[PDB]
Paper text:
Copper-containing nitrite reductases (CuNIRs) catalyze transformation of nitrite to nitric oxide, which has impacts on geochemical, agricultural, and medical health fields. CuNIRs typically have an ∼110 kDa homotrimeric structure, like a Reuleaux triangle. Each protomer contains one type 1 copper (T1Cu) and one type 2 copper (T2Cu) site. The Cys residue forms a peptide-bond bridge (Cys-His bridge) together with one of the His ligands at the T2Cu site to transfer the electron to the catalytic T2Cu site, which is coordinated by three His residues and an axial water molecule.
Residue numbers in the entry:
A (entry chain A), B (entry chain A), C (entry chain A): 18 to 315
The structure:
Amino acid sequence: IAAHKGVNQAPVPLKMERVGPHDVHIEMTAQITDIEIDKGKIYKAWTFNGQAPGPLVVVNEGDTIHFTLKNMDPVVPHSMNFHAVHASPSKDFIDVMPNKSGTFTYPANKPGVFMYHCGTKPVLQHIANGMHGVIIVKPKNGYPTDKEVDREYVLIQNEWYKYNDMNDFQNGVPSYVVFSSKALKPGDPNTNGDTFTLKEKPLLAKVGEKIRLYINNVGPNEVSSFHVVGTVFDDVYLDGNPNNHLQGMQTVMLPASGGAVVEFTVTRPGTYPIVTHQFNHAQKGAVAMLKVTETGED
Amino acid sequence: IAAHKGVNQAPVPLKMERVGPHDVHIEMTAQITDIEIDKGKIYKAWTFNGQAPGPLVVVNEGDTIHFTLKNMDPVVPHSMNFHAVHASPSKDFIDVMPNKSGTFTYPANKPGVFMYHCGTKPVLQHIANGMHGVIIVKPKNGYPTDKEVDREYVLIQNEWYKYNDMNDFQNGVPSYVVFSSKALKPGDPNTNGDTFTLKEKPLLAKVGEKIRLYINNVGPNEVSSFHVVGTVFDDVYLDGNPNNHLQGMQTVMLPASGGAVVEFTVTRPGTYPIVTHQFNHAQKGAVAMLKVTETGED
Amino acid sequence: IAAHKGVNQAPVPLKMERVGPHDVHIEMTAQITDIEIDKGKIYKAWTFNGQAPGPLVVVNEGDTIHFTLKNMDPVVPHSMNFHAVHASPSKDFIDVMPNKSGTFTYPANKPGVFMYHCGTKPVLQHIANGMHGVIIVKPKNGYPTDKEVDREYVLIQNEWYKYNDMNDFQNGVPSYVVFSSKALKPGDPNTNGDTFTLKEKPLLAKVGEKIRLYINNVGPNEVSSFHVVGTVFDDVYLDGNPNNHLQGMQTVMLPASGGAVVEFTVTRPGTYPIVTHQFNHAQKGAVAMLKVTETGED
Ligand SMILES: [Cl-]
Ligand SMILES: [Cl-]
Ligand SMILES: [Cl-]
Ligand SMILES: [Cu+2]
Ligand SMILES: [Cu+2]
Ligand SMILES: [Cu+2]
Ligand SMILES: [Cu+2]
Ligand SMILES: [Cu+2]
Ligand SMILES: [Cu+2]
Ligand SMILES: [Cu+2]
Ligand SMILES: [Cu+2]
Ligand SMILES: [Cu+2]
Ligand SMILES: [Cu+2]
Ligand SMILES: [Cu+2]
Ligand SMILES: [Cu+2]
Ligand SMILES: [Cu+2]
Ligand SMILES: [Cu+2]
Ligand SMILES: [Cu+2]
Ligand code: NA
Ligand code: NA
Ligand code: NA
Ligand code: NA
Ligand code: NA
Ligand code: NA
């Protein structure tokens, strides 16, 4: 795209603020930002806020979201589809033109771990170029295991293909499959989908802890066989809905866009890989690490 | 196949009639019929009754099916495998030769949304060329959410490959992935697996309704990440068995041959896409539309 | 690998013995063994004990496993990862060098049907070359349907690729997809992952029986759509955990490394195919047979 040559828009922080007991404002950008997806490999990603996947959004069950998208792309329209919400797609998930903003309002009625993404046609192109992310909707009544959880993180799986290549997007294997982590609390890591950061800077935990991961496989195209080496999931809530409660799973099958809340215990000090067990994808980048120490500090 | 050149057998209606409180007769054909699977692209499909996927069958839990296949193919044997039934495959799912009929009897003991397909070796070839469909077995005691449902439709996902090409069937990506709808009540659409009909003639609903979809991914080869844009599934019954009850799912993972009953609420007027969220497949055709109006009429 | 040329190490029996009410010893080898994966096609597999998948391990919930690996490979290190156990991967799943042994101890706290595999980097290479298997952990309180089961077997699904070809392992379709059975009781078959043995020598059962299969899809790369022709699964326990209880499923979606306990009734004499319903994989070998006779003998 001629108008994207040389464009590298600096990341912009997510803007969120609560405006009522059940109403929140969210503003994001659509912007074109260079991301190092593998060592020496830059992808000029189509992004929300200069991150791919985009910034984490967390709201409460029953919140109405007043969402603004500011399109900084000089030529391509962009939009927003939140899987969390009940909305009219043809009125509320519509395109925002270059250098314009649009505001859309809709409720998040359902607890869970939802994908969000750009919904501009061709949707495959917008997702594959980087316009994906997660919104967590916290259940009003919690999860039955909340009291047992010591530490929690968010992980997202995505693929990367040949740059802006619709033939490859439709017909080719992924070049990379990757994990990223998005921060829930101050001090948590906040990373983009790449083959290396969560290997070189593992997530941290303490011996004996029960860890919760909020996970989503945003695709665009693959399913995920999510597994933590050296443990078994004590409890799994499919899509993060507390009703969808499995126990003692080795591996959680996630569709494309599928989410889960998974919980597991780390019993011994060491480094614990986190994979998709589709090992072709793991080999192409989709391995993160959890470093478990006697203190929980590095 | 030399004997199929120029052959285009007109579709033949499904013949069904109840013959006892727990016994039904079903007659279908195997026939060779040209279907427009994408604009300008004719596939000389191997079919039941001149439809691909084939005609919808609906029976009640506990019905015994007395099934007749009339093979109109001039050269290829065909057969019938219903996933709904308990049967001896080597006695009851056997081949019917060209220009012959066979009758097979077996019970449908289990409620749900089942695949049916030709079972003639090589089964991949017969399924991929179009010999797939759905049989719904209605639960004797219903679903716990029956009273909440306002409107219901059937959707089926399938793939299409290069014509009768066993190398492609085994080793290649699908050329098209498609949805079709099969009629449950007079006035419902009844379509074949193509890339366009359910975009140009969306399914219809009314603002505020709870919609039930009976869905099955017949493959032959892919899994499906089934998602309705702008809503969340209130309730999901895996394989249509009332016991297998999930709530609040964004996306339902279907294996090849996998079924579900899914229910969701449409809260606002507009057009709602229905996808597999494996977006390579969506791009290759697997997007249907649901048009939601203030009246439920177009 | 030059040091593997001409190497064909004869299979070695699994060594297991109970050493306390909640402690068991297991010794396995890593060894290089020629396996006929399709007629006329030898794969010089990387194996545990000269089988691929490896030998079946069965323990009780709450057993601690004292595991020894004896590496007979002349040049490649190998290791062991049991999905059943809680362990430190970086201390307990570590490499054993050629011509050495290592012993590792860890508890199997969770009931189910778990994958095991070599964990040596690149893990994809070790799994794809044959270093995979199943460990069953029997639930202390059984399954609620135990009293109904008449006969049981273990089935494992795996893929085979071009020989030791990491490009193919990462980027190519499988050349073969296969089932094997591993013996639970004297007289049960014990086979390797090949395209033919369970067709030519079907598993045996008796008309009217309820059959339990302990199943796992070890991959390395594909998911599985597990289906028995001519029946419906009465009960399914995902990952073999008794809590994860589905009923009346036609087909069970298994992630890579995913397990299940599935139970079904065979109502009539005949031969019943067992497939992955991803029919490209079935065509490439993944069809086993269950022969149901009036006596249960051939
Ligand atoms: Cl692993
Ligand atoms: Cl979508
Ligand atoms: Cl089948
Ligand atoms: Cu309030
Ligand atoms: Cu506002
Ligand atoms: Cu966009
Ligand atoms: Cu979406
Ligand atoms: Cu704790
Ligand atoms: Cu009656
Ligand atoms: Cu009759
Ligand atoms: Cu046929
Ligand atoms: Cu089938
Ligand atoms: Cu209503
Ligand atoms: Cu004891
Ligand atoms: Cu010992
Ligand atoms: Cu190894
Ligand atoms: Cu593993
Ligand atoms: Cu019995
Ligand atoms: Na792929
Ligand atoms: Na792919
Ligand atoms: Na494919
Ligand atoms: Na495919
Ligand atoms: Na594949
Ligand atoms: Na593959």
